[PDB]
Amino acid sequence: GLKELLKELNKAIASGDTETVRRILEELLELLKEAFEKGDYDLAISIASMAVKAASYIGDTETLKELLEILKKIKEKLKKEGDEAALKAVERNIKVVEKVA
Amino acid sequence: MKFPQLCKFCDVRFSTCDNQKSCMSNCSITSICEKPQEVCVAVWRKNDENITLETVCHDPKLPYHDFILEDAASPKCIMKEKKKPGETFFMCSCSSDECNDNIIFSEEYNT
């Protein structure tokens, strides 16, 4: 499902289809909340990467700020966990978002 | 200002990829790259029976494992062999999102 959403997201970005982007962003945010609440942090980071791109494209600063907040929560958890690639990824995503939120 | 690539970024992981035309990375972490110029990279290594797959972002201005990135502009991760004593080593770089999730050793052809 997520591979197809990414494909559709990029098709829409490339073609200027802002309505599709906004729809996909809404779906990603729902998927993100579910992954986060299940403690599936690798999946949450992954979804968040995509959501950040979609929210950036449509200029949705409020969503970017929400994504920064959830990423910071993920970081707080992973600081304690010893999965270095996941911790580095959440931190990398935070630095990218901080440019736009 | 360019939004960075999204790449698989699990660093070095054990892998089951062997004797296959293509492999999925089985990396559960898609990260945004830090820097806009970075591309996705996959490195497949087999030393005796130990197979690893490395997934990262990397700036193609720089070598990686002391090799120059080839056709980093391609959207697809086309694996190519490098000379490395004592092991089999293949690498690819690519510039489309999650492109280092789909590692290509050979294509399928309609005949």
Spatial separation of the C-alpha atoms in residues A54 and A49, rounded to whole Å: 9
Q: Are A70 and A44 in contact (CB under 8 A)?
A: yes
* Pick among B1, B5, B6 to test the A interface (most A CBs inside 10 A): B6
Assigned token pair, A1? 């499902």
Q: Are B50 and B41 in contact (CB under 8 A)?
A: no
Domain edges within chain B: 6-104
Assigned token pair, A61? 């600063």
HEC secondary structure over chain B: CCCCCEEECCEEEECCCCCCCEEECCCCCEEECCCCCCEEEEEEEEECCEEEEEEEEECCCCCECCECCCCCCCCCEECEEECCCCCEEEEEEECCCCHHHEEECCCCCCC
Spatial separation of the C-alpha atoms in residues B86 and A40, rounded to whole Å: 38
Structure's resolution in angstroms: 1.2
Domain edges within chain A: 2-97
Assigned token pair, A74? 């993920």
Determine, for residues B9 and A10 on separate chains, whether the beta-carbon distance falls below 8 Å. Answer: no
Inform me whether the C-beta atom of residue A94 falls under 8 Å from chain B C-beta atoms: no
Spatial separation of the C-alpha atoms in residues B70 and B56, rounded to whole Å: 15
Write down the CATH number for the domain with range B6-104: 2.10.60.10
How was this model experimentally determined?
A: X-ray
Q: Are B69 and A87 in contact (CB under 8 A)?
A: no
Determine, for residues B28 and A43 on separate chains, whether the beta-carbon distance falls below 8 Å. Answer: yes
Residue (of B32, B21, B5) closest to B104 by Cα position = B21
B4 contacts on A by Cβ (under 8 Å)? 96
Spatial separation of the C-alpha atoms in residues A3 and A80, rounded to whole Å: 30
The distance in angstroms from the start CA to the end CA of chain B is 44
